[PDB]
Design a protein around this ligand. Structure first.
Ligand code: CLA
Ligand code: CLA
Ligand code: CLA
Ligand code: CLA
Ligand code: CLA
Ligand code: CLA
Ligand code: CLA
Ligand SMILES: CCCCCCCCCCCCCCCCCC(=O)OC[C@H](CO[C@@H]1O[C@H](CO)[C@H](O)[C@H](O)[C@H]1O)OC(=O)CCCCCCCCCCCCCCCCC
Ligand SMILES: CCCCCCCCCCCCCCCC(=O)OC[C@H](COP(=O)(O)OC[C@@H](O)CO)OC(=O)CCCCCCCCCCCCCCC
Ligand SMILES: CC1=C(/C=C/C(C)=C/C=C/C(C)=C/C=C/C=C(C)/C=C/C=C(C)/C=C/C2=C(C)CCCC2(C)C)C(C)(C)CCC1
Ligand SMILES: CC1=C(/C=C/C(C)=C/C=C/C(C)=C/C=C/C=C(C)/C=C/C=C(C)/C=C/C2=C(C)CCCC2(C)C)C(C)(C)CCC1
Lengths: 80, 132, 146, 743, 40, 131, 73, 33
């Protein structure tokens, strides 16, 4: 459904993965930052488009960007 | 192993029976009252507990509440109409907020957000700048 | 005593067993209604439903319509009812096409194309005929006086 | 020891001006300092939210008690000013002598910039603004007579204001009560229901029986105000009272004995309205308060305190449970004794509801001398109290929601009434939605149907008293019941409680005070519209309370708070999903509801009640009875009401009513101004600000407190505020200007 | 005193005082020199 | 367990503006667009639940559930690869008297259950398997 | 604003009283009272409790417009 | 006579035509080619 992309400016603060309401983001090993960790979006099929993740990023400009797109039952948050 | 609840009009509907359904499980050390996302209050059982919901978010919301009770053994599954089940969370046994060796990066762009291509350049291509 | 319990003993379904939802009265009435009754064929189900709905529809038009005070008011009311029945029938036809498709197999399941078509046909006949019956009845009203 | 005791902490807070110089001290976040303009706005928006400023109920409670003293001080100063202005800047004396001709005025403008035109020739060799609050009538009923007395009550008011302010300081800085003291509901109710209300009524009855009644009788008879004996004289010379009411001769002997009948001279159940003044008989009012006093005092002895006898509210609440309601009312006591928001909800709703009742009962049964004939005052009071009520009711709902989000605890509420309500919320809201649609389609449809029919030249097909008719049969029936009550179901009464139900036309000064108000098809149509408006308001507000903590869309709304902008652009859009936003939308519907009600009052009265009657029986209503056949269509309201009754404001220039014209226009402007906050978004504004800041920077200067655009929530608030001010303001001027002329 | 002076130095308070002064002087000018649509 | 059951759906990702099937598929294999209620003694939604004498509320009769025993299997299958990576690393770090990966797994999971095994660092594992 | 100006100016000219615009156009109340209020009398009386005329269709549309506008809100 | 056309066409254009058109659109948007 929606598209979430992570950029090299990430600092591995883990704040984004701790804010997702649907477990779409994970922290994976990396060497480009001091923390030695980067964020990934393995399960974008469950993204609802809340953008809470973006609100949590501390980088000058979001290192995590959510681009809204095709809509499915899951993305539209339909319990019915 | 269902927790003690008296019923509500905010439970699941047909989609749960014809499209898809979700289920969370956890273990408790005491019988305590929790608030369910559907609306209302329920009492968990002293031991294994199972509850069904219609959305993954509803399940994960309850997990947050469970963490307050110091319960961190919760598991979430998706049950399809035919009976097939998918284990969803914690996927690799380790919570996502904790780096676990063995997980590969996905959807990562190796440059600052400002280095994406110009829209005009990719015209009549079908791709987007952020996917280019 | 608790008169409200989880439906089907499922504490997590979105429904409750209240006196209104599950009482002998409600159960009995709904079981014997033409829509859910056992044994009725698709055509007969439609017929009964149509007979019922057509009889009460002539009233509103006949007594409150544009030509209510005219000597031909009842006739006009009948025509108006027939028009409404046609509109409703179009809806039924269209619904069936979209919901069921083009070729069916199960058969004798109100929820199939063939059965639905039969149901629709019954409704039309029953409704129009019922409206006609009301026309005949309203032509001369009995005072039931001895 | 004793269940009910007084616990107070001495010298709790030091009095100093240090915190005054540290704006934002109350908040941890704001205290750090200003970095953007948002800090400024937040300072003002979180000033009185004590729950977020401290985590101890005792502290929150202490602040509330003291803050209340502050409001009381302000109220006292307000009343004091009014009496003073009525002593030094009014024509009360002249009006007192000729109430029918002289017009009430208590405000005078300085002769600056032609504003003097606003000083009208009210009468009595006096020029000023015609006031419409009804002070003169009240003072006459009390028996003021002089302006010296008004001065003294003003001084008393100032003194009282000071005492209250001291009390606030004292009970917060020097003697602050502890939480245990506050949590004594039974005692509080016993004291407030027997002391505040019971003793209050009894005391008032004393004034009315010994001072007001006698003086007013003399005034009505014709005695010149100067010739009426001073109040103290009546209190001392029993003989004087005996002349007026021939029972004081017997003294209090009849009272101690069981012969209360002898006091029938001043305690009566006459009913109806005094023919001379057009107001309720004071004798009846005196008996009213006396009777109420006894009732309240008795009621104040129902709850247990420190002597065993009495009721414990907890027990009463818990016992009331049934087969369909689980644990019943268990858990409510704790909620109402541990949550200020919950208490405010109930109290605020009831207070607003009372105001609406006051509005209805105070016009049908005019309570003051020479009030009914003053159409301006009547209209002003009805509308004023109708509004105050609407706001308060919506406020109750708001604080109810704040409770659910901040104080509700699942553990303390298992299978109680509250829990069960939140467990079938879908059913409740679904049904109410339908009810609203049903009512709205049918009620408003009637009007649209009629408009179409009249325009198509088919008047015989309209829902009118001359065609298809929709008569209010039930109401017509109740009216008859109330009309025939005197002498039957109410044997000892002498007349109808109100002439509205039926009776004769009471006229004072050639003007109609009250007349039977009849109900027909038009009334049916409008009443059902009122139902629709109120029902929709409840839907929005109730939905907010029930879905405050969670919803299928946002399962964790509680954590987000009571006032969050949204959850995001996802799920298809989650804008305005907070409980605060439900209150935001509810206020708009409350505005609509009240507006229609006040308009109904204005047109119905000016068409079927108010007017003049000749010496013989010829009644000429102000508008001529147009309500019956014109209020059945929307075009009628636009033409026979708004367009026609607005001729006064639009043509007020060059007159003492010019102010209303200017305000009418100003209000329209503010209403429109608000639509820019209600339709736009923060994004556009923030970007515009960026460009503007560029200019300032280009000239080597820019504020360190970086300029930022108003928050999403504040934008909505600013819009609603201006919208309400503009709309209400417009009607305010429209009504007042029209009323001045009709009077 | 020092602290009170700081409170009196706050933005809201100073604005009100300044505007009251400005308004007053404008009103006073019109009181003594009234009705002017031009410098005569 | 068909780990691809969800992935095997009718959804076809679009060119641009779609995240894709993700990790567990984007949509249910089954179509939600089924029929409504049916008369007594009849069924509508294919493998639907008979409403008995209350066909009107048949959709409220659950037929989809989770077997606790089966739940264990799905947990193991979906986390098989992770377990493999974990044990592999443990093997790489010169295990004391190592035998076979599988054998080690059984021994290491005999103790420390399985969930605990998945959440333990190779170092902790080696310490645990010192014996 | 542009259209209102053209109409009112021309209306007064056609009516033979150009002075009304010349003097009342200086302040806002003039526009509301001498233009919108005064010239709305024919329209609001297209259909009344006493009959109807050829301006009925125009009257009805006027109210119809108000509805759509507010519904937009 | 052409004069009768207003009473024969208007009923069709304003009632029959719109209905069939709406029906066709529904069938078109509810079909899964
Ligand atoms: C004139 C402007 C206008 C109108 C007509 C409406 C209409 C409505 N609002 Mg609304 N609203 C408005 C302005 C308006 N709003 C503004 C400015 C705001 C901002 C505060 C809101 C905020 C608001 C909220 C927050 C809520 C509403 C709700 C409602 C609905 C009430 C239910 C009802 O009576 O249905 C009847 C609707 C009618 C328009 C009645 C007239 C229609 C005819 C006369 C009846 C017959 C027509 C028939 C059905 C079809 C004819 C066929 C043919 C015409 C094609 C209704 C749809 C409530 C709602 O949805 O709950 C139900 C609700 O919760 N409104
Ligand atoms: C919504 C309010 C409303 C109502 C009640 C009416 C009523 C009426 N209109 Mg009118 N109209 C309205 C709005 C309304 N109008 C609006 C908004 C417009 C503008 C578009 C018009 C334009 C209009 C025209 C142009 C004409 C009318 C006409 C009529 C009359 C014919 C009635 C008819 O044929 O209905 C038929 C009704 C039905 C077939 C069904 C009625 C609903 C049923 C009774 C509900 C039953 C519910 C049931 C109790 C549920 C429980 C069941 C359980 C116990 C088993 C009637 C007096 C005609 C006339 O002669 O005027 C007098 C006419 O020519 N109307
Ligand atoms: C509800 C309260 C209330 C209200 C609204 C009014 C309103 C009015 N009174 Mg009135 N009055 C009141 C109570 C009230 N009064 C009381 C209780 C008394 C008894 C003392 C009086 C005694 C009184 C007299 C004797 C007179 C008025 C007059 C007036 C009118 C002119 C007001 C004025 O001075 O303008 C001009 C305003 C000023 C000169 C004040 C200057 C503005 C100050 C400096 C701004 C405030 C500074 C700010 C708070 C700084 C903050 C510091 C921080 C520590 C808080 C006005 C209509 C006058 C009138 O009608 O004359 C015809 C008049 O002569 N009143
Ligand atoms: C001159 C006497 C005096 C002094 C020096 C103080 C000093 C103090 N009080 Mg105190 N207080 C006083 C009188 C005084 N009080 C009185 C008479 C009352 C009863 C109403 C209170 C009630 C009170 C409460 C309830 C609280 C304080 C608090 C405080 C402390 C913080 C100051 C603050 O919040 O700034 C406030 C500065 C202002 C300028 C606010 C004035 C707002 C005005 C009154 C609104 C009305 C104006 C107008 C009429 C309405 C609009 C038109 C500070 C030690 C707070 C504290 O820190 O507690 C721990 C606190 O919670 N006081
Ligand atoms: C019989 C005793 C008595 C009386 C008269 C009151 C009266 C009042 N209480 Mg109260 N209270 C009492 C006992 C009493 N209380 C007890 C025992 C408790 C503890 C359980 C409380 C706890 C309490 C709280 C927690 C609060 C109140 C509040 C209030 C006020 C409500 C606002 C109102 O109606 O304004 C009416 C206003 C007036 C009538 C103005 C006059 C007020 C003075 C104080 C009356 C005192 C008597 C007076 C001097 C007459 C003496 C008679 C003499 C002339 C012969 C009101 C003044 C609220 C408030 O706002 O307090 C500030 C509030 O928050 N009370
Ligand atoms: C008994 C009355 C009463 C009391 C004690 C409270 C008390 C409270 N309310 Mg509440 N409320 C009430 C009535 C009341 N309310 C009513 C009637 C409504 C419906 C409109 C509301 C709606 C409401 C909302 C929606 C919210 C509160 C909140 C709050 C809390 C913080 C208030 C705050 O931010 O202070 C600061 C106070 C202000 C900034 C108000 C200043 C006045 C503004 C600027 C409007 C002025 C209009 C003015 C009269 C127009 C003059 C025109 C002129 C210029 C020409 C506090 C517990 C807030 C909260 O967070 O609760 C926890 C919150 O979100 N209330
Ligand atoms: C151009 C379109 C059009 C036309 C030609 C008509 C024509 C008519 N309308 Mg009307 N209407 C329209 C649009 C139109 N409407 C719209 C858009 C609305 C919504 C606002 C309405 C709402 C409306 C109401 C509420 C009412 C009418 C009524 C009427 C009838 C009054 C005259 C008469 O003799 O009644 C007397 C009636 C008769 C003599 C019966 C005539 C025979 C009928 C019409 C046969 C219909 C069969 C038809 C083929 C079925 C359609 C099939 C489908 C596939 C299209 C007349 C037939 C009134 C009426 O009585 O309705 C029948 C009435 O109450 N109309
Ligand atoms: C009926 C057979 C004989 C009729 C006759 O002889 O006409 C002769 C009569 C003529 O009756 C006419 O009535 C008018 C109105 O009052 C006139 O005023 C005269 O009374 C009269 O000339 O026809 C009838 O009115 C009775 C016929 C009623 C038909 C019953 C309804 C049957 C169902 C109709 C719907 C058909 C659509 C699909 C059906 C499935
Ligand atoms: C209204 C009739 C009434 O009062 O019934 C009252 C009914 C029975 O109440 P109980 O006597 O069982 O419970 C008693 C306690 O609630 C205390 O009175 O309660 C309901 O279930 C209301 C259902 C929603 C209301 C339907 C609309
Ligand atoms: C309120 C209520 C109720 C209900 C009621 C109702 C709702 C009723 C209805 C009724 C109805 C609604 C009925 C109907 C009827 C119908 C009919 C009776 C019909 C008939 C028809 C016929 C007989 C035939 C026809 C025809 C045809 C078929 C075709 C051909 C032609 C002809 C004509 C032959 C009761 C009492 C139960 C109880 C209480 C509650
Ligand atoms: C207007 C006003 C005011 C007021 C004033 C007043 C109100 C005065 C009066 C005062 C008074 C003048 C009071 C009085 C009181 C009295 C009383 C309250 C009485 C009581 C009684 C009793 C207590 C009795 C008892 C008993 C009995 C029961 C019987 C037997 C014997 C005995 C003795 C035991 C002020 C200025 C504040 C402010 C402004 C406004």
């Amino acid at each position: 459904s929606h598209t979430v992309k992570i950029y090299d400016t990430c600092i591995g603060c883990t704040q984004c993965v701790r804010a997702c309401p649907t477990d779409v983001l994970e922290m994976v090993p990396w060497d480009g930052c001091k923390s030695g960790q980067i964020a990934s979006s393995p399960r974008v099929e469950d993204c609802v488009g809340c953008k809470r993740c973006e609100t949590a990023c501390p980088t000058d400009f979001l290192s995590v960007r959510v681009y809204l797109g095709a809509e499915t039952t899951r993305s539209l948050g339909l319990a019915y | 192993p269902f927790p003690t609840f008296g019923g509500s009009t905010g439970g699941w509907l047909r989609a749960a029976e014809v499209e898809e359904k979700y289920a969370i499980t956890w273990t408790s050390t005491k019988e305590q009252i929790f608030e369910m996302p559907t609306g209302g209050a329920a009492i968990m059982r002293n031991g294994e507990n199972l509850l069904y919901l219609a959305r993954k978010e509803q399940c994960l919301a309850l997990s947050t509440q469970l963490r307050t009770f110091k319960i961190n053994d919760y598991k979430i599954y998706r049950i399809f109409p035919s009976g097939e089940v998918q284990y969803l969370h914690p996927k690799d046994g380790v919570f996502p907020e904790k780096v676990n060796p063995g997980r590969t990066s996905v959807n990562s762009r190796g440059f600052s957000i400002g280095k994406n291509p110009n829209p005009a350049s990719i015209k009549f291509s079908g791709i987007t700048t952020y996917e280019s | 005593a608790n008169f409200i319990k989880p439906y089907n003993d499922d504490p997590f379904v979105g429904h409750l067993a209240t006196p209104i939802t599950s009482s002998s009265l409600t159960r009995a009435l709904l079981k014997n209604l033409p829509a859910y009754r056992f044994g009725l064929t698709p055509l007969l189900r439609g017929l009964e439903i149509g007979l019922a709905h057509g009889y009460f529809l002539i009233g509103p038009f006949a007594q409150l319509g544009p030509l209510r005070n005219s000597d031909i008011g009842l006739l006009a009311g009948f025509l108006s009812t027939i028009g409404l029945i046609l509109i409703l029938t179009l809806g039924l036809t269209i619904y069936g096409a979209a919901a069921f498709g083009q070729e069916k197999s199960n058969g004798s399941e109100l929820q199939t194309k063939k059965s639905w078509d039969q149901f629709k046909g019954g409704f039309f006949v029953g409704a129009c005929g019922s409206a006609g019956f009301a026309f005949i009845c309203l032509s001369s009203i009995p005072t039931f006086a001895l | 020891s004793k269940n009910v005791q007084v616990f107070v902490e001495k010298d709790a807070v030091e009095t100093s001006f240090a915190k005054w110089a540290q704006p934002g001290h109350f908040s941890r976040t704001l205290a750090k300092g200003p970095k953007t303009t948002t800090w400024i706005w937040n300072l003002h928006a979180d000033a009185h939210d004590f729950d977020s400023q401290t985590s101890s109920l005792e502290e929150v409670s202490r602040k509330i008690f003291s803050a209340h003293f502050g409001q009381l001080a302000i109220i006292f100063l307000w009343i004091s000013g009014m009496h003073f202005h009525g002593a030094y800047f009014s024509n009360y004396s002249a009006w007192l002598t000729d109430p029918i001709s002289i017009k009430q005025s208590s405000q005078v403008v300085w002769p600056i910039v032609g504003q003097e035109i606003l000083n009208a020739d009210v009468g009595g060799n006096f020029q000023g603004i015609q006031t419409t609050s009804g002070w003169f009538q009240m003072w006459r009923a009390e028996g003021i007579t002089s302006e010296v007395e008004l001065y003294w009550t003003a001084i008393g008011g100032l003194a009282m204001s000071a005492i209250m302010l001291f009390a606030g300081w004292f009970h917060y800085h020097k003697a602050a009560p502890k939480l245990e003291w506050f949590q004594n509901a039974e005692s509080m109710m016993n004291h407030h229901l027997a002391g505040l209300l019971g003793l209050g009524c009894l005391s008032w009855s004393g004034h009315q029986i010994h001072i007001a009644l006698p003086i007013n009788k003399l005034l009505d008879a014709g005695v010149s105000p100067q010739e009426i004996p001073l109040p103290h004289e009546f209190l001392i010379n029993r003989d004087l009272m005996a002349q007026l009411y021939p029972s004081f001769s017997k003294g209090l002997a009849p009272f101690f004995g069981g012969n209360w009948g002898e006091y029938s001279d001043f305690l009566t159940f006459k009913g109806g309205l005094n023919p001379v003044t057009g107001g309720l008989w004071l004798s009846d009012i005196a008996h009213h308060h006396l009777a109420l006093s006894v009732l309240f005092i008795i009621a104040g002895h129902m709850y247990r305190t420190n002597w065993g006898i009495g009721h414990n509210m907890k027990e009463i609440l818990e016992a009331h449970k049934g087969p369909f309601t689980g644990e019943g009312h268990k858990g409510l006591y704790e909620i109402l004794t541990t949550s200020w928001h919950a208490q405010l909800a109930i109290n605020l709703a009831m207070m607003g509801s009372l105001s609406i009742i006051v509005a209805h009962h105070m016009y049908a049964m005019p309570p003051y001398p020479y009030l009914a004939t003053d159409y301006a005052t009547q209209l002003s009071l009805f509308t004023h109290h109708m509004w105050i009520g609407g706001f308060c009711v919506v406020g109750g709902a708001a604080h109810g929601a704040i409770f659910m989000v901040r104080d509700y605890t699942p553990a303390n509420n298992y299978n109680n009434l509250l829990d069960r309500v939140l467990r079938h919320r879908d059913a409740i809201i679904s049904h109410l939605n339908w009810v609203c649609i049903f009512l709205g389609c049918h009620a408003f449809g009637f009007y649209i149907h009629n408009d179409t029919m009249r325009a198509l030249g088919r008047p015989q097909d309209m829902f009118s008293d001359k065609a298809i008719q929709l008569q209010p049969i039930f109401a017509q029936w109740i009216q008859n019941i109330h009309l025939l009550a005197p002498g039957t179901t109410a044997p000892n009464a002498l007349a109808t409680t109100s002439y509205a139900f039926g009776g004769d036309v009471i006229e004072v000064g050639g003007k109609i005070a009250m007349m039977p108000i009849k109900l027909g098809t038009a009334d049916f149509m409008v009443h059902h519209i009122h139902a629709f408006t109120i029902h929709v308001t409840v839907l929005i507000l109730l939905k907010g309370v029930l879905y405050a903590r969670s919803s299928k869309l946002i399962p964790d709304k509680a954590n987000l708070g009571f006032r969050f902008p949204c959850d995001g652009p996802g799920r298809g859009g989650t804008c305005q999903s907070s409980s605060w936003d439900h209150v935001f939308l509810g206020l708009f519907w409350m505005y609509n509801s009240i507006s229609v009600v006040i308009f109904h009052f204005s047109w119905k009265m000016q068409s079927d009640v108010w007017g003049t009657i000749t010496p013989d029986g010829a009644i000429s209503h102000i508008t001529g009875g147009n309500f019956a056949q014109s209020s059945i269509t929307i075009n009628g309201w636009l033409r026979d009401f708004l367009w026609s009754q607005a001729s006064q404001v639009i043509q007020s220039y060059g007159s003492a009513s010019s102010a209303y014209g200017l305000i009418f226009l100003g209000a329209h402007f503010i209403w429109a101004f608000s639509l820019m906050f209600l339709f736009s978004g923060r994004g556009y504004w923030q970007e515009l600000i960026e460009s503007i800041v560029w200019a300032h920077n280009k000239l080597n200067f820019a504020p360190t407190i970086q300029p930022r655009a108003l928050s999403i929530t504040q934008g909505r608030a600013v819009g609603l505020a201006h919208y309400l001010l503009g709309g209400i303001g417009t009607t305010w001027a429209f009504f007042l200007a029209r009323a001045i002329s009709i009077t | 005193m020092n602290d009170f002076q700081k409170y009196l130095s706050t933005a809201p308070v100073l604005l009100t005082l300044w505007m009251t002064f400005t308004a007053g002087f404008i009103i006073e000018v019109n009181r003594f020199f009234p009705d002017m649509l031009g410098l005569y | 367990v068909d780990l691809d059951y969800g992935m095997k759906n009718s959804y076809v990702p679009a060119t641009g503006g779609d995240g894709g099937q993700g990790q567990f598929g984007a949509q249910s294999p089954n179509d939600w667009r089924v029929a409504g209620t049916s008369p007594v003694g009849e069924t509508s939604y294919a493998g639907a639940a008979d409403g008995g004498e209350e066909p009107w509320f048949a959709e409220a009769i659950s037929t989809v559930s989770l077997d606790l025993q089966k739940a264990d299997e799905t947990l193991k299958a979906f986390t098989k690869d992770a377990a493999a990576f974990k044990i592999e690393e443990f093997a790489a770090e010169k295990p004391y008297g190592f035998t076979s990966s599988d054998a080690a797994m059984e021994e290491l999971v005999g103790k420390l259950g399985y969930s605990k095994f998945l959440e333990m660092s190779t170092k902790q594992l080696m310490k645990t398997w010192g014996t | 604003w542009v259209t209102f100006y053209w109409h009112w100016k021309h209306m007064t000219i056609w009516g033979g009283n150009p002075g009304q615009f010349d003097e009342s156009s200086n302040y806002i109340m003039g526009w509301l009272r001498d233009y919108l209020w005064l010239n709305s009398s024919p329209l609001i009386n297209g259909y009344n409790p006493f009959g109807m005329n050829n301006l009925s269709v125009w009257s009805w549309m006027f109210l119809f417009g108000h509805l759509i506008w507010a519904t937009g809100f | 006579a052409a004069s009768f056309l207003p009473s024969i066409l208007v009923p069709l254009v304003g009632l029959i035509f719109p209905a069939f058109s709406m029906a066709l659109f529904f069938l078109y948007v509810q079909t899964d080619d």
